[PDB]
Subunit: 238 residues, 4 copies
């Protein structure tokens, strides 16, 4: 009986917390990583954006854990004669969280080891194979306190096509499910694993996105969020 | 303009149209196919169950088509020294529709040929390979006027495990998406394809389920619905719905 | 456990149970009482309209009672050199209920005496003073098994102005609240009282409307429903509902 | 198609902006004005509390105006041998708004004249007659840029009884409606007037409450919010 819900088809900076390169465009697109005046994404970009209100994920008195779901449309595009990098992620982080390392660490980590004090749960849409931890194919991944996903599924990434994502968390089964569909291509992908939010996250978090572009010439992308809905519910006992 | 929503964690016959073998158990479960007096599914069973109010899927005056979503939990169980058959489906059908042939035709069809006047959109959960039309592995299928799915994905069926399904239809993209998760196994499956509702279905439909048991000894299953939510809008927020 | 919600900005007969004179106009309006071929309401008319699916209001196993809310826009208009009669009501009634006596009994009652087997909870919008039971001024009333309201408030009725109604029932406090606003006049009215649903209504009900025209020359009105939303929950967020 | 919704049966300070004397108690009650360790409210108190995310009320490009609704339960109680003062209000204010004068000005105004730059829309629950502007009976009032309500209705205030309020705004009719019911007493009250949000408010606002206690001995109250739900919807055009 704590409940929060929002849904935006267009964005504005007034109710968002924007970090580093993240901007809202004059078309109300949330552009997580830098794009120049020619409309070309640039290298070594990092941006993160969050809803301005913190969200209660669990409660240390009752032991209750929230159920949540989020949907969003994103557009990742690539200039001709480049390949994509590095990707974007929906995230749950500590209130006051600041950006970490760029590139393949997605602004979320400092290295590729597990860190039980990272307090990070993310669903990544990873467009670049990082030899020290990634599966080879592009992938949707569930990340808990590491850039090395606890679970992944192959994602047949296609540049410039709008991708519609749904992520759900059921606190009774502890199941986190992420799916992506490309409506114009009629293709769909799904990954699922259990996550113990209560052991990983603080009681309150900020929710939103992080994204990076490649550090090396020829590996680059736009990372645009086009719409976002979020809902959470945390039982209080009446 | 029009919105409809319902959600049941337990079922009752009062607001449901039950057909053939479909019963509401005394524990509030929707048993679509017959279980005997001991707790065993029986062969050749067919049952269909629908919400008692018709849903408007599209409008010929405005041309608008509904978006909808549905979620349900189901339990398919199989007796020992037996295999599963034949599966269950969520369906959209014309008002007043009657059960068709049982078995692998799921109470929805007379034959395995394409029938352009069947007016059927269904998402099937197929537990038995029918050599004449099915893919070999167990599958989730999107059925449009035919038992031969327009698209399927592999489903790693496991007996007696609760399965959670989400089906969504986006009228702006004409995309129908169906996913199933087994929460205790942490496995997940998704299939997607476009369906033009306006040329397949009448303007008003009934929504619900159909299921069958196998007709041949050793091929049988329970087809139980444990909970069901539906929403439609005709002129969806999926984060809100899934919650 | 159980939740039901619907919202219509335009009506269609397909999902409605229409009774006596109640028609859906070709412009999607729910005309509860008869209008002639020219656009004039006629005397002695009675019409009732219900959502086609039964709603569960309470459960005898658990003891739980539903909370619900409903909102609707209505237009009561009156011809020149005439006064209004007899009004319209939102009702909860047993499944299969038939119209009762017309006129000031609103199609809900046979007489003006308390009937403990009428199984009726209604919110009336009363346009005609019935000397034997009504307060003198026009009123909103909460009717429980009787046409003599358990509670009323003064309603400054104005002909042909759209009226927006909100009715809520909180099962935890047993409180039923009804309010009406005239947006173009900026006037508002509210009445509240407790109703014990569990001892008045069956476990399953039909929700909808009833209306009547006056039986005596010069007392007549249109009773039109322009839009309708309903929600119930059986184990409400009113900020969400009203929006 | 911008939509925001929240509903809390218990409060926590983490997602609220609290000003001056406002606190959240260990029972998760939002206590807008000061209460001492004996549970007695004190004089000359002022507190305000807001949801931490700003809410978009209108849009200067499309001219669209939001529809909203809010419900809340409040408890105003009075020690024996005092009378109540001064009351509480649900408010829509500029982002960054700071408290104004205490007592009968409810933390919202500096005097009792109209001020077209106050950017204030409030629904007041006024428990003390202020001779220079109030109607004599206690009242629910609609306030637009003045402590002198544009419209009022008599409120039969009863100390210590939970009051359930619903406030709705329809941007198509511009009608603001406020109602209060006391469920244990079965009584109910309603006020309605039109308000042009676009001429009064900035495009984005903070939503929440303000309350004060009397400045003069014998005029005092608790001003506790017990639950709160809010929803708004602003058309974007798809
Ligand atoms: C080792 C590796 O993964 N190299 C790829 C490189 O990755 C960058 C940086 O993004 C990574 O976070 C760190 C991991 O320590 O390594 C490098 O510094 O990104 C390139 C594209 O920009 C790839 O071509 C390399 O394969
Ligand atoms: C040909 C075939 O599919 N045989 C399988 C059989 O199918 C039944 C029935 O279920 C089908 O609907 C019709 C299709 O015309 O054929 C048969 O009568 O079901 C058996 C289990 O019940 C399978 O083992 C057969 O392979
Ligand atoms: C006695 C009375 O109420 N007379 C009014 C009359 O009422 C009709 C009918 O509407 C009532 O239901 C029954 C109650 O027994 O009495 C009459 O038959 O309606 C007239 C307008 O139609 C009023 O002017 C009478 O005052
Ligand atoms: C003049 C008046 O209203 N006096 C009442 C007094 O009001 C305070 C303060 O609360 C008001 O905002 C200002 C208006 O200029 O006047 C006074 O300073 O509050 C008393 C209770 O504390 C009442 O008894 C007075 O009637
Ligand atoms: C966001 O809103 C404010 C108006 O409050 C405006 O100043 C700003 O330019 C807006 N940005 C966009 C992209 O709409
Ligand atoms: C269905 O509802 C009726 C009450 O109207 C009741 O007799 C029956 O027990 C209900 N079924 C279940 C499974 O609860
Ligand atoms: C009711 O629905 C049917 C389509 O099934 C249509 O023929 C009729 O025009 C509809 N009524 C209105 C008022 O639109
Ligand atoms: C609010 O939440 C935080 C836990 O994140 C806690 O420190 C604080 O004491 C809480 N207050 C109440 C009243 O629950
Ligand atoms: Ca990578
Ligand atoms: Ca088959
Ligand atoms: Ca009357
Ligand atoms: Ca005052
Ligand atoms: Mn990866
Ligand atoms: Mn099949
Ligand atoms: Mn009456
Ligand atoms: Mn006042």
């Amino acid at each position: 009986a704590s409940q929060t819900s929002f849904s935006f088809q267009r964005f504005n900076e007034t109710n968002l917390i924007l970090q580093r390169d993240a901007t809202v465009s004059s078309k109300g697109q949330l552009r997580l990583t830098n794009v120049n005046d020619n409309g070309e994404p640039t290298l070594s970009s990092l941006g993160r954006a969050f809803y301005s209100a913190p969200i209660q994920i669990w409660d240390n008195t009752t032991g209750a854990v929230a159920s949540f779901a989020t949907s969003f449309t994103f557009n990742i595009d690539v200039p001709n004669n480049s390949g994509p990098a590095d990707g974007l992620a929906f995230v749950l982080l500590p209130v006051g969280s600041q950006p970490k390392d760029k590139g393949g660490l997605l602004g979320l980590f400092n290295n590729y080891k597990y860190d039980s004090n990272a307090h990070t749960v993310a669903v990544e849409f990873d467009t670049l194979y990082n030899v020290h931890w990634d599966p080879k194919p592009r992938h949707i991944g569930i990340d808990v306190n590491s850039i090395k996903s606890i679970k992944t599924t192959t994602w047949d990434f296609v540049k410039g096509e709008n991708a519609e994502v749904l992520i759900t968390y059921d606190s009774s089964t502890k199941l986190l499910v992420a799916s992506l569909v490309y409506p114009s291509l009629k293709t769909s992908f799904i990954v699922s694993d259990t996550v113990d939010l209560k052991s990983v996250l603080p009681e309150w978090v900020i929710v939103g996105f992080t994204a990076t572009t490649g550090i090396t010439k020829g590996n680059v992308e736009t990372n645009d969020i086009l719409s976002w809905s979020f809902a959470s519910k945390l039982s209080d006992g009446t």
